[PDB]
C-alpha cells in the first residue's frame, strides 16, 4: 500500500483466501479492465 | 427567488384533492375495520393488474401474507405531500425517490396501500428479480472496525452476514434472498437489515436524445398509473419483472 | 509524414475527437503520433459518414425540441438509420479461427458488464444485452460440455474452453454489488463493449449454426423467473470427448441454498449432471445422492446422501478424474488448491 | 468584421433619430405571462404538419384501398392562420378573433397598417415579440402574423377572457404613448 498503484495492485493481488464463504467483491477488477483498455489505446 | 403566482395555487388545489381522498380513505377504512358497513360503497377490496389500451384485470383481495416489492415513484405534478402519507413513507423509508423495498402483505398492512397509492407502484415480484436486486444492489449500514459509523458496505462478506445474523442462524446472502422469498421463519430481520435500496433513474435526461425518452415514458406512465381518488380504489399491480428490466 | 498529431488527423477527418477515439479503438488503429496511410485508409468509411449524419441528426433533433414539435422528432427518431459494426468485423477477422483466437478478450468485458449493476451512464438495455449474450455463451458450453480447466480465486473464476482449437480463457466475477469507481470513464469500455458485443454476436451465430441448432435461443419465461441463467434457455435440435465431458454421467446433485448456485450450476452442466437447489424450490428428491454444501452443522444427516464441500467439483474437473471426498466432507480441512497454471 | 460592425451600428442610428409614431407601437408589446398564456393557447391550435397530413392521407387512402369506406364524417380542422395576405383576408370580413403581430420584420412596411387596421375593424390585435416564435407555432421558419378564428367550445371561454386580458393590457396601457414620437435620444 506504500507503493504506487501500479506496484500496489499486483502486490495486493494475492491475499489470504479463507474459504468459500467470502469473496471480497472486486474493487480492483474494474480498474484492471480500464487499465487494460488504456494499454490497448 | 420570486417563485410565481401559479404554482402556489396549483399546489393548494392538488393538496386539497389529496387531503380529500385521504379523508375518504380514512373514514371508509375506519368503517370497515370497526365493521360498521351500513352506507358505504363496497365491503370487500380489489386489486388491479395491468398487463399487455392494455388488459387490466381485477381480483378480490386475499387476506394472505404476500411478498410485495414497492417502488417509489415521483409523486404527482405540484403536490405538497401530506403529513399522514409523509409519516408512512417515513416509516417505509421511501423518501429520496427511485427507492423500493420488500414488504409483507397482510390485512393490517393493506389499508395504508390505499393511502400511499399515488406515490409508489406495486406488483408481484419474481425470484430472479429479487435475486438480481440483491446480488446487484444493496448496502448495509454497518458497525465496522473503527468508524464514525454512518457507514454502509455492499454485500460481499457472508461472514459479516452470519456474524450479525447468527442468532437466527442466517448466513450467505443467497439465503437472505431465499428467506425474503420464503418468509417462513423471519422476513423482518432481513427487512430491517437490508434497510436502504437505491435504483438509478432510467433515462439520463438532459440532452437532445433522452428528452424523447422522457416524454415517451411520461406518456407511458400516464397510460399505466391511474388515480382513482374513490377510497374504493383497486390496488394497481404491475409487472415488476418488466419494471426491474428497466430500473435494474 | 509517418507521425500525425491527433488534432491534425481529427481536423482532416472533420470528426469529433471522442468519435475519433471511438474509431481508433473500433478499427484497431494505433499510434498523438499516427500513421498517415492508416488515416488514409480511415479517410473513406461509411461509419464515419453515419457518425457525421448522427451529429446533424441530433442537431435537427435539437431544433425539433426547440420548436416544440414533438411528432416530427418522433418521425426523426423512428426514421433513423443505425450504423452497424459488422463489416469491419468481417474484414478485420476474415478467418473464423482468428475470431476464435480473439474472442478471449471479447468475452471478459461482456461478462464484467453482465455482472455490473444499472447506472445512468450504462443503460440497463446495455446490461440486458450483456447478460443475455453471456447466458447464451454459457448455454452453448453446456451443450458440448467441453471445458477442462477450473480456477478458484479472490480475483475471478477463470475457465478456458477446449472448443475448435484453442482453450479460451474467459472469467466471471461473482454476482456481488460493486462500488462503482469514479476514476474510470465508461466512454471507452462502452466502445469495446459494443464492438465485442457485435463480434461475439456473429461468432455465436457461427457456433450455433455450426452446432446445427437455432441461433435465437428460446427460454421459458417461468424458467427464467426461477433463475436468470443459462438454464433458462431451452436449446433446440435443428460423442462427448472423454473424460471431462460426461464426467459424472447419470449423476444427481443436491446443491444447497447455502452454496453459490451459479458457477456450481455451470460446472454440473459442464458435467451433464442435474441441479437441484432448494432456493429454486421455494419459488414454486428421490434420486439425489450428493449434497454440495459448506456448513459446519448438517441437519438431517442422511447417510445415503453424500456430504461434500464444493472444492471436490473444482478439483475433479481440474484433474478430469474422481478423487475421494473425505477432505471435502464437512468440516474437514482442504488441500490448498493451486490450479494447473 | 463589417457585418458585426453594421449590426451593432444598427439600432443606434434608429434610436438616435426621431421615429414616427406609427412605428414604436412595436416594442410597446405584450408582457411576460400574457404572452405565455397566448402561446399556451396557440399550441393547443397548432396546424397540421406536412408529415402528419401525409400520414393521415395514407391512413384514409389505405382505408379506401381496402374499401372499408369507414364513414363520411369530420367536423372541421381548426388551426391558427398564418399567411399574411390570408391574415389580412380574414380581416375585412371580419373573422379574426385574435391577431398576433411580430415586432421585428425587416420590411416593416408589410406590417405597419395592421394595428390601425385591426383598430378600425375592432379586431383584438396584439403585438407579439419575435416572428420566429410565430414560425415555431406554425411549423415555418418565421410567420410575422398569426390569426385565429375558429375555436372549440372547450376553449371559447378561455378565448374571451384572453381577449379581455389583452384589451386591458395592451389597448389601455399603450394607446396614448402610441401617438408619441419615439426615440430621438442619442447614443
Swiss-Prot record, chain B:
Which GO molecular function terms does the record list? mRNA binding; RNA binding; rRNA primary transcript binding; structural constituent of ribosome
GO BP annotations of the record are: exonucleolytic trimming to generate mature 5'-end of 5.8S rRNA from tricistronic rRNA transcript (SSU-rRNA, 5.8S rRNA, LSU-rRNA); maturation of LSU-rRNA from tricistronic rRNA transcript (SSU-rRNA, 5.8S rRNA, LSU-rRNA); ribosomal large subunit biogenesis
The alphabetized UniProt keywords are: Acetylation, Nucleus, Phosphoprotein, Ribosome biogenesis, RNA-binding
Q: Which residues cross the membrane?
A: none
Q: A cellular component term (GO) from this record?
A: nucleolus
Q: Where are the Phosphoserine modifications?
A: 204
Per the record, the similarity remark reads: Belongs to the universal ribosomal protein uL30 family.
Question: Anything else of interest in the record?
Answer: Present with 7720 molecules/cell in log phase SD medium.
Reported function:
Involved in the biogenesis of the 60S ribosomal subunit. May act as a specificity factor that binds precursor rRNAs and tethers the enzymes that carry out the early 5' to 3' exonucleolytic reactions that generate the mature rRNAs.
Name of the protein in its database record: Ribosome biogenesis protein RLP7
What species was this sequence derived from? Saccharomyces cerevisiae (strain ATCC 204508 / S288c) (Baker's yeast)
Span of the full-length protein shown?
54 to 322 of 322
Swiss-Prot record, chain C:
Expression induction: Expression is down-regulated prior to the diauxic shift.
Q: From the UniProt record, give one GO term of the biological process aspect.
A: maturation of SSU-rRNA from tricistronic rRNA transcript (SSU-rRNA, 5.8S rRNA, LSU-rRNA)
* GO MF term set: large ribosomal subunit rRNA binding; mRNA binding; ribonucleoprotein complex binding; RNA binding; rRNA binding
Is rRNA processing included in the keywords of this UniProt record?
yes
Keywords assigned by UniProt, alphabetized = Coiled coil, Nucleus, Phosphoprotein, Ribosome biogenesis, rRNA processing
Which intervals of the chain are annotated as region Sufficient for interaction with ERB1?
32-341
Range of residues in the leader sequence: none
Please state what is observed when this gene is inactivated. Answer: Essential gene. Reduced assembly of 60S ribosomes and accumulation of halfmer polyribosomes.
> Which segments constitute the BRCT domain?
243-330
The cellular component terms of Gene Ontology attached to this UniProt record, alphabetical and capped at eight, are: nucleolus; nucleoplasm; nucleus; PeBoW complex; preribosome, large subunit precursor
Main subcellular localisation: nucleus
**Cellular compartments annotated:** Nucleus, Nucleolus; Nucleus, Nucleoplasm
Its job: Component of the NOP7 complex, which is required for maturation of the 25S and 5.8S ribosomal RNAs and formation of the 60S ribosome.
Something else the entry says is: Present with 4530 molecules/cell in log phase SD medium.
Q: How does it assemble?
A: Component of the NOP7 complex, composed of ERB1, NOP7 and YTM1. The complex is held together by ERB1, which interacts with NOP7 via its N-terminal domain and with YTM1 via a high-affinity interaction between the seven-bladed beta-propeller domains of the 2 proteins. The NOP7 complex associates with the 66S pre-ribosome. Also interacts with NOG1. May also associate with the origin recognition complex (ORC complex).
Family the entry assigns: Belongs to the pescadillo family.
Q: What is this protein called?
A: Pescadillo homolog
Native source species: Saccharomyces cerevisiae (strain ATCC 204508 / S288c) (Baker's yeast)
Q: Which residues of the full protein are shown?
A: 13 to 460 of 605
From Swiss-Prot, chain D:
Q: Which GO terms describe its cellular component?
A: cytosol; cytosolic large ribosomal subunit
Does the keyword section mention Protein biosynthesis? no
Enumerate the GO terms in the molecular function aspect: RNA binding; structural constituent of ribosome
User: Disulfide connectivity?
Assistant: none
Localization in the cell? Cytoplasm
Q: Which domain of life is it from?
A: Eukaryota
Q: Please classify the protein's predominant subcellular localization into one broad category.
A: cytoplasm
Sorted keywords for this record are:
Cytoplasm, Ribonucleoprotein, Ribosomal protein
Q: Name one GO biological process term.
A: cytoplasmic translation
SUBUNIT field: Component of the large ribosomal subunit (LSU). Mature yeast ribosomes consist of a small (40S) and a large (60S) subunit. The 40S small subunit contains 1 molecule of ribosomal RNA (18S rRNA) and 33 different proteins (encoded by 57 genes). The large 60S subunit contains 3 rRNA molecules (25S, 5.8S and 5S rRNA) and 46 different proteins (encoded by 81 genes).
Q: What does this protein do?
A: Component of the ribosome, a large ribonucleoprotein complex responsible for the synthesis of proteins in the cell. The small ribosomal subunit (SSU) binds messenger RNAs (mRNAs) and translates the encoded message by selecting cognate aminoacyl-transfer RNA (tRNA) molecules. The large subunit (LSU) contains the ribosomal catalytic site termed the peptidyl transferase center (PTC), which catalyzes the formation of peptide bonds, thereby polymerizing the amino acids delivered by tRNAs into a polypeptide chain.
Additional detail: Present with 238000 molecules/cell in log phase SD medium.
Similarity comment text for this entry: Belongs to the eukaryotic ribosomal protein eL8 family.
Its protein name is Large ribosomal subunit protein eL8A
Q: Which organism is it from?
A: Saccharomyces cerevisiae (strain ATCC 204508 / S288c) (Baker's yeast)
Gene name, per UniProt, is RPL8A
Q: Which residues of the full protein are shown?
A: 53 to 239 of 256
Amino acid at each position: 500500500x506504500x507503493x504506487x498503484x501500479x506496484x500496489x495492485x499486483x502486490x495486493x493481488x494475492x491475499x489470504x483466501x479463507s474459504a468459500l464463504r467470502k469473496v471480497p467483491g472486486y474493487g480492483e477488477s474494474i480498474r484492471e479492465r480500464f487499465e487494460r483498455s488504456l494499454d490497448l489505446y | 427567488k420570486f417563485v410565481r403566482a401559479e404554482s402556489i395555487v396549483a399546489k393548494t388545489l392538488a393538496t386539497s384533492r389529496e387531503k380529500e381522498r385521504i379523508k375518504r380513505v380514512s373514514i371508509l377504512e375506519d368503517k370497515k375495520a370497526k365493521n360498521e358497513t351500513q352506507h358505504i360503497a363496497s365491503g370487500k377490496d380489489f386489486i388491479l393488474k395491468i398487463t399487455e389500451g392494455l388488459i387490466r384485470e381485477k381480483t378480490t383481495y386475499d387476506g394472505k401474507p404476500a411478498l410485495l416489492f414497492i417502488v417509489r415513484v415521483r409523486g404527482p405534478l405540484a403536490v405538497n405531500i401530506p403529513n399522514k402519507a409523509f409519516k408512512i413513507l417515513s416509516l417505509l423509508r421511501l423518501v429520496e425517490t427511485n427507492t423500493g423495498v420488500f414488504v409483507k402483505l397482510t390485512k393490517n398492512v393493506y389499508p395504508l396501500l390505499k393511502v400511499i397509492a399515488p406515490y409508489v407502484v406495486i406488483g408481484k415480484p419474481s425470484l430472479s428479480s429479487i435475486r438480481s436486486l440483491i446480488q446487484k444492489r444493496g448496502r448495509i449500514i454497518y458497525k465496522g472496525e473503527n468508524e464514525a459509523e454512518p457507514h454502509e458496505i455492499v454485500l460481499n462478506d457472508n461472514n459479516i452476514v452470519e456474524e450479525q445474523l447468527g442468532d437466527h442462524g442466517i448466513i450467505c446472502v443467497e439465503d437472505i434472498i431465499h428467506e425474503i422469498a420464503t418468509m417462513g421463519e423471519s422476513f423482518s430481520v432481513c427487512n430491517f437489515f437490508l434497510q436502504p435500496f437505491k435504483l438509478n433513474r432510467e433515462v439520463s435526461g438532459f440532452g437532445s436524445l433522452n428528452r424523447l425518452r422522457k416524454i415517451k415514458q411520461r406518456e407511458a406512465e400516464s397510460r399505466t398509473r391511474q388515480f382513482s381518488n374513490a377510497a374504493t380504489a383497486p390496488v394497481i399491480e404491475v409487472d415488476i419483472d418488466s419494471l426491474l428490466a428497466k430500473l435494474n | 509524414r509517418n507521425f500525425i498529431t491527433r488534432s491534425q488527423a481529427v481536423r482532416k477527418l472533420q470528426v469529433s475527437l471522442a468519435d475519433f477515439r471511438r474509431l481508433c479503438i473500433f478499427k484497431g488503429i494505433y499510434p498523438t503520433f499516427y500513421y498517415a496511410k492508416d488515416i488514409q485508409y480511415l479517410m473513406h468509411e461509411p461509419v464515419l459518414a453515419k457518425f457525421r449524419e448522427h451529429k446533424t441528426f441530433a442537431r435537427k433533433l435539437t431544433r425539433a425540441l426547440g420548436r416544440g414539435e414533438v411528432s416530427s422528432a418522433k418521425r426523426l427518431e423512428e426514421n433513423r438509420d443505425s450504423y452497424t459494426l459488422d463489416h469491419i468485423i468481417k474484414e478485420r477477422y476474415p478467418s473464423f479461427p482468428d475470431a476464435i483466437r480473439d474472442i478471449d478478450d471479447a468475452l471478459n468485458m461482456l461478462f464484467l458488464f453482465s455482472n455490473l449493476p444499472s447506472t445512468n451512464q450504462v443503460s440497463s438495455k446495455i446490461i440486458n444485452d450483456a447478460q443475455k449474450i453471456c447466458n447464451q455463451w454459457l448455454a452453448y458450453v453446456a451443450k458440448e460440455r467441453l471445458v477442462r480447466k477450473v480456477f478458484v480465486s479472490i480475483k475471478g473464476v477463470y475457465y478456458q474452453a477446449n472448443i475448435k482449437g484453442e482453450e479460451v480463457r474467459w472469467l466471471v466475477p461473482f454476482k456481488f454489488p460493486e462500488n462503482i469507481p469514479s476514476d474510470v470513464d465508461f466512454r471507452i469500455m462502452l466502445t469495446f463493449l459494443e464492438f465485442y458485443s457485435t463480434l461475439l454476436h456473429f461468432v455465436l451465430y457461427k457456433l450455433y449454426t455450426d452446432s446445427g441448432l437455432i441461433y435465437p435461443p428460446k427460454l421459458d419465461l417461468k424458467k427464467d423467473k426461477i433463475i436468470s441463467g443459462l438454464s433458462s434457455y431451452i436449446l433446440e435440435s435443428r460423442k462427448y470427448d472423454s473424460p471431462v465431458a460426461s464426467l459424472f454421467s447419470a449423476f444427481v446433485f443436491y446443491v444447497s441454498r447455502e452454496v453459490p448456485i451459479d458457477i456450481l450450476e455451470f460446472l454440473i452442466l459442464s458435467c451433464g449432471g442435474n441441479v437441484i437447489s432448494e432456493a429454486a424450490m421455494d419459488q414454486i428428491m428421490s434420486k439425489v445422492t450428493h449434497q454440495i454444501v459448506d456448513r459446519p452443522v448438517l441437519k438431517n444427516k442422511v447417510a445415503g446422501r453424500t456430504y461434500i464441500q464444493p472444492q471436490w467439483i473444482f478439483d475433479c474437473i481440474n484433474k478430469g478424474e474422481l478423487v475421494p471426498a473425505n477432505k471435502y466432507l464437512p468440516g474437514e480441512a482442504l488441500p490448498p488448491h493451486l490450479s494447473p497454471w | 468584421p463589417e457585418y458585426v460592425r453594421v449590426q451593432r451600428q444598427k439600432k443606434i442610428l434608429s434610436i438616435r433619430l426621431k421615429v414616427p409614431p406609427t412605428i414604436a407601437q412595436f416594442q410597446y408589446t405584450l408582457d411576460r405571462n400574457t404572452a405565455a398564456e397566448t402561446f399556451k393557447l396557440f399550441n393547443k391550435y397548432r396546424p397540421e404538419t406536412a408529415a402528419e397530413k401525409k400520414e393521415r392521407l395514407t391512413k384514409e387512402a389505405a382505408a379506401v384501398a381496402e374499401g372499408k369506406s369507414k364513414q363520411d364524417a369530420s367536423p372541421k380542422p381548426y388551426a391558427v392562420k398564418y399567411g399574411l395576405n390570408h391574415v389580412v383576408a380574414l380581416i375585412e370580413n371580419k373573422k379574426a378573433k385574435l391577431v398576433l403581430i411580430a415586432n421585428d420584420v425587416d420590411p416593416i412596411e408589410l406590417v405597419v397598417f395592421l394595428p390601425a387596421l385591426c383598430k378600425k375593424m375592432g379586431v383584438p390585435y396584439a403585438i407579439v415579440k419575435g416572428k420566429a416564435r410565430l414560425g415555431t407555432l406554425v411549423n415555418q421558419k418565421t410567420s410575422a402574423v398569426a390569426a385565429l378564428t375558429e375555436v372549440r367550445a372547450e376553449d371559447e371561454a378561455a378565448l374571451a377572457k384572453l381577449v379581455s386580458t389583452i384589451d386591458a393590457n395592451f389597448a389601455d396601457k399603450y394607446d396614448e404613448v402610441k401617438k408619441h414620437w419615439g426615440g430621438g435620444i442619442l447614443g
